[PDB]
Point group: D2
Chain length 209, copies 4
């Protein structure tokens, strides 16, 4: 790359044509709507969980992605490594707003199912989710060639789904639900970063933290 690439003011001002929204704008768009089911992706949507994925990679498959298909990894990831996962502020704000609305709150994750899991407790605890709004996390798993989330959004009648991945947005689209994008943080170990806004979907401002 050039040592001194420079810039110009067209470039400095240039905006991607993205429908950006705030939590306040979402809440307003739902004003007077009665309680409904809504859902959240977990990783890079409500939890910065890269710490535990990074430990798993290093412990179980330093050269490859094999750790993500290792049951010994998932058993660690789902039963205590989320103690090191950093809650996202956008998620605190979204979840408070949905509890305010009286909405049923679901978490739908591509993480693999394990014998036991403490993830539901970590989420209920960290985000102050009352018993009545909280539901046990759905571990839909990862199966290339299939969006494992879509069936679950349909089964739970989820009408809004938040996620950082293209699969989160298209799971919502698959069922006619409203898909809303959260920015994956740039220090996530899950790379490349997705193209937020790539489906014409809403993207929440400042949602990387």
């Amino acid at each position: 790359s050039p040592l001194n690439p420079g810039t110009n003011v067209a470039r400095l001002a240039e905006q991607a044509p993205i429908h950006w929204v705030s939590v306040a704008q979402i809440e307003n768009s739902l004003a007077g709507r009665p309680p409904m089911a809504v859902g959240f992706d977990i990783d890079d949507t409500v939890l910065f969980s890269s710490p535990g994925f990074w430990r798993g990679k290093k412990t179980f498959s330093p050269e490859s992605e094999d750790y993500l298909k290792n049951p010994v990894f998932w058993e660690k990831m789902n039963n205590g490594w989320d103690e090191f996962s950093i809650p996202k502020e956008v998620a605190r704000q979204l979840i408070d707003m949905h509890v305010r609305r009286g909405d049923a709150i679901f978490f739908v994750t591509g993480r693999s199912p394990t014998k036991t899991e403490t993830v539901s407790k970590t989420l209920a605890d960290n985000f102050h989710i009352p018993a009545t709004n909280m539901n046990p996390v759905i571990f839909a798993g990862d199966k290339p060639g299939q969006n494992t989330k879509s069936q679950w959004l349909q089964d739970k009648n989820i009408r809004i789904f938040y996620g950082d991945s293209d699969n989160d947005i298209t799971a919502a689209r698959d069922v006619g639900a409203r898909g809303i994008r959260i920015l994956r943080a740039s220090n996530s170990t899950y790379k490349p970063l997705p193209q937020a806004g790539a489906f014409g979907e809403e993207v929440i401002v400042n949602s990387e933290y």
Copy 2:
């Protein structure tokens, strides 16, 4: 204002919650829709006309805004000083797009009316608007015998109005047309700059030039 204020990455990544759109997105939204009337504000929407307004302020009221109520100024402004106005590329793109659709093109200005005007010719020439799509500039306002921007949009069944000022957006909203915002350039002499998107309207990307 510290000499060395510094910054941080939250501020660097910070986005206003704005519904940004492109010309391509607007065109996409109109696919299959029959020819219709569309409208443009003039100043800082299709022409950077500050050069003529700057000269008029210096010439007719260097220490006030009285030049804007001075018939002598308007006669100059509407009969040749737009030879120094700079066409905005966002407008070239939109007018080409609407002409290709077979839309009727209208211009609705709050400039004071004059005995003669050469602004219609300047616009048809600069923007290569065919005679069949072109319409004489409409001078809207609140002087006796005039109609407001709103009433003209209603009269001409204008379905989409493009403008840089709050009043262009509200004019369209008042009659249920689609108000679409264009950025006023930072070097405009019409200050302060409006808050594009202040009504949750669509704002065109990169529309300051």
Copy 3:
């Protein structure tokens, strides 16, 4: 281009490695330095003069760049079309600061020399430059294959030179002077926009207006 290109937060936060400065920072870096000669480029540095260049193009060579070698154009451009040129705020601030310092102020322009010129008066007037700091504009002209400015920076012992063009910065470099970049506005008819910072030079923040 894709209809919905999207973005990510690495891209949103990404900064070119540019030495950005404020007028306050420049003034501080010169604190206690005795009066010296400094110089300014005119076009897109102190004056948004695109109005007159745009009129010249349209009047004299709508299909080409031939107007810039037409003496009939320069005679118009240098004797009254700068009445439509919009002073830049960065230049008001820079020039006030240099007058404060007791600096000798020069304007060095690639515009062609004419029989008479009112540009010096326009500049002295618009920027409130006292007789003692003001010097007549130097019309160095345009001669491909030669930086016509460098000899003049040498002759006048100019120690700091402000400009939007690569030739302004390298004229300063040619003579060991401090070259400082001003952003060309995105609505200028002089395109493409230069790569500000391309020589490792300082670039003044917000200098497009």
Copy 4:
């Protein structure tokens, strides 16, 4: 905080007056310079270590900062919780660059000292630092028998110190070393984010990851 705040192009193009640099620019500045001692702060400079700090706050002082004065926390933090810390790519690039130069690599941390520490191994492993360039982590501070970050930089003749906090920059400045700033990530639990560039120091581009 309006629901729909909008924006304008002055704000969109606005740049803080910061001396931004790249790794390539830093390396260029060191061309021909013999091997030397360089230094790195640890937390939010070379490691995103918030995961361990977040767990310690929840574990040892959920409602205060007392965990930072709790020997039990530090013993955990310095003896394994950095397996969940995420290496910053800006640090990989700088350490590789300095190692290739044959520079001595130092780490100077304000973390509390412990009986044993495994952080040196974590850093040498994660960053592939050869034994000949690696040095045991230095724990600096103001406890009896300790020396400050400044005194250690002086002691080890560290010529360049990289850090995210104000105190890293001032430490280097105090002894006449080159203080270079790295952006603290927005999802760090160490808040508020510092104003990188607050002392007119160089700030590395894109250094939040």
